[PDB]
Each structure stands twice: as structure tokens, then as C-alpha cells.
Amino acid sequence: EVQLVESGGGLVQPGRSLRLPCTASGFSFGDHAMSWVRQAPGKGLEWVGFIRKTTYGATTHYAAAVRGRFTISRDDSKSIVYLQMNSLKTEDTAVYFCTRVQLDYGPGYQYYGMDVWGQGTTVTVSSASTKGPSVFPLAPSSKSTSGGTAALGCLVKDYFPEPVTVSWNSGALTSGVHTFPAVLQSSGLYSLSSVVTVPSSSLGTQTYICNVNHKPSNTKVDKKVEPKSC
């Protein structure tokens, strides 16, 4: 079957460079233009650039955001197309997909839909390294209490890499708990929150502790979440 396989992902510092090879199989690589597309974590698709067949000079065309920084090239004898990324910026962080441009003929011209996609490879541009989280309480108050139910939680900030797990009262409190996925800040560090809803009457009588584990930094944090009388 037709197949594309990217390699070469990884973590690289801003201002450095990385090459991604993409190997094609199951079709005649040289018969097709090839196109790169990227998808930053949580975001939509964004075209990177494409390269024509060698018989036409293998000319290339890029999105404005990577012009003068990224270079696409191809080697038809090895069925490989390369994405050379120079001058990397944090906002280049994305999954990079290698794609094949179709040959289907329309009314007087060829279409250019991307009809085969690789699985994609992650490129992270960041100066972050292993870092344990800071844990802050999200104290319950009148502003988080509705109809006799109070929400409280804990904010787990600026850690690397994923993941952290959160439990409440050592696993004894599970009803109403939700731990959210993390957000990636531009600094390259992650943050998340965990929330639980409890009866507002229990607040003076029950203790609530969120247990944060970040195994990459060998850190555990048990944060007491005290209610605010406002």
C-alpha cells in the first residue's frame, strides 16, 4: 500500500536546526510533488511548504512563516523527501506531517489535494528541561459555591515534561473529581488543574488535600486546600 514514514523528531533549543526525512513506499515517489503540513499542539493544520518533481527543477514554495528558514529537498533515487528546519523558533513546535500531492486530472489542469499522509512526527522547540511543579490551592469560597455545592481544586504550574497525576485525600475522594489536561505555555512548561465538588457544609469539618505526583522529577506534593471565609 501507499505509505509515508517521517523520522527525526525531537526536542531542540530555539535557534538550532533539525532535519526530518520522510520515506515513501508503495508508489513511484518521483512522479509526485510532496507537501509538508504541521499542527501545533491543540491547534489546526498549517501548511509548511511543498516541492515539485525533479523534472521541473524540484522547485519549492513555502508559507510566509518559514520562508528563509525551512528548506525542502528530495532524493528521487532513495524515495526520500527532507524538511530541513533552520533558525528554529518556539512557535515551530508542532507535529510535522509529510504528504503526497495527488496527480488526478481535473478540467484542463491537475488538482493538488494531499492524498497520502504520514503519521506525523513531533518537533518540540524549547529551552525547558526536567522541572517539578509548583502547586497552588484553588480555595473554595462564596464565588465557587452554588446551591450548597462548593468547588475547590489545585493548580499545578510550570513542570516538564508531562505527565503529572493528581488524586484527592490519598485516593479516598473520587466522587466529583476531574483532573484536566495540561496546557503548554510558550516557555515550554506545562500547567494543569484538578477540581473536586463537595458539600459546602463539609468545608469547616472536612480536610481536602490534593496529591500531585510528577515522576520525571521524583516530586510528590500534598497541598492542603483551606476554605476562604468570603
Partner: protein
């Protein structure tokens, strides 16, 4: 996106017909550039769905149809099936960008449970974080269906876009969805305003919660 505009979400029950619009410009669809559609199933790479405005690749069933008229394109799904839950992206060439442009993407939900409006809780910076010279507002959204919201922030009634981070919705234990959004501020920014608000839009309706820096400090 800028030059191609899609609705962030669309939904319907199994068997229904839904449409996804792709509103273009005279620098792309209106100038005659063809429209392409890509389907991205959750956790997968995109696949070509429609090429050259209305053509289906082999392997794409005929409940998918594409049309174009003027500066607009549209993807119809006639007879929604469960496996069609996916993000859909339209794509066209744009001469003001001189590149291949994508719409922002539409999440299609195939409804399997009753719709449910979101609950919203907004947390101010904790004193502990403030004492560490940082400030994060935390807006938590829960118990909603389908799993698509938009979150906007305000300071003193005025929009604020810098410093915002939002997660894509994910399932809670009760099978509804939750989402979170964060506003990062300096302690001085926080203290300098009278109010901060998060506004959560779900199915064209909006829930807004407000905190005041002068309270709970």
C-alpha cells in the same frame, strides 16, 4: 483561520444531514481557487476527504459531498454515522498569503446523549501564587455536551487576548465534557483592574463569571 472561516463545531444525530461552511474571500475561493476538505479522526493523521470542490477519493463514501458557490464552500454529510465524529478542515490557495490556506477546523459531534449547558467556576490567583510574584486566573467549565466551547476573557469589561491558554474538552466520569482556560497576569496587572471575567460560549449561548481583585484577598 484568517482567510478561510469555519464554525468551530457542528452536531447532529445519527442519520441526519449536517453542513459545514467554509467562508472564503476574493483572494481565495472567490478568485476561483479550488476547495479541498480534510478529515482528521481523533488521534489520527488527516486524510483527504474531498478534492477539487466535489470529488471523493476511493474509500470516501457518498454521504460526503462538497459544493462551492462564490466565496463560499460547503461540506455536507447526508446520513451522519458515528464514525464521522472528527475534525474537518477546508483548504484553498490564497493570493494575499501566497500559500495554501486552511480553515480553522470544525469539530463534528454525532449526538449520543442529551445536550447539556456548561457550568462555570472562575478562580482568582491564590495568595500563595501572588506571594510568589505570579498570578493565574483559572476558569473551569464542566458538565456540558457536545464537547465544544469557546472561551473569551475580559478585564474591566474590555476584551483581553494576550496570556490566554485553553484546553480542548475531555470526558468527565459522567460522560459529559469539561474544559479549562487560564489567564496569566502579573500581580500588578491583577491588582490594577476592578474586575476580570471569563465568558464561555456553548451552542450560541454564553455563561459569564466575574471576580474582583479587591475581594477575597
Amino acid at each position: 483561520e484568517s482567510v478561510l472561516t469555519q464554525p468551530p463545531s457542528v452536531s447532529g444525530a445519527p442519520g441526519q444531514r449536517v453542513t459545514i461552511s467554509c467562508t472564503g474571500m476574493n483572494s481565495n475561493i472567490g478568485a476561483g481557487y479550488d476547495v479541498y476538505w480534510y478529515q482528521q479522526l481523533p488521534g489520527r493523521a488527516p486524510k483527504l476527504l474531498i478534492y477539487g470542490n466535489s470529488n471523493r477519493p476511493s474509500g470516501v463514501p457518498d454521504r460526503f459531498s462538497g459544493s462551492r458557490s462564490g466565496t463560499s464552500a460547503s461540506l455536507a454529510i447526508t446520513g451522519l454515522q458515528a464514525e464521522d465524529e472528527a475534525d474537518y478542515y477546508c483548504q484553498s490557495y490564497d493570493t494575499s498569503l501566497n500559500g495554501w490556506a486552511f480553515g480553522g477546523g470544525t469539530k463534528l459531534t454525532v449526538l449520543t446523549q442529551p445536550k447539556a449547558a456548561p457550568s462555570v467556576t472562575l478562580f482568582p490567583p491564590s495568595s500563595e501564587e501572588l506571594q510568589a510574584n505570579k498570578a493565574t486566573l483559572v476558569c473551569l467549565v464542566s458538565d456540558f455536551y457536545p464537547g465544544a466551547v469557546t472561551v473569551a476573557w475580559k478585564a474591566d469589561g474590555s476584551p483581553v487576548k494576550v496570556g490566554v491558554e485553553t484546553t480542548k474538552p475531555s470526558k468527565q466520569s459522567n460522560n459529559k465534557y469539561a474544559a479549562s482556560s487560564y489567564l496569566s497576569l502579573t500581580p500588578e496587572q491583577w491588582k490594577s483592574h476592578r474586575s476580570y471575567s471569563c465568558r464561555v460560549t456553548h451552542e450560541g449561548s454564553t455563561v459569564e463569571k466575574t471576580v474582583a481583585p479587591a475581594e477575597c484577598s
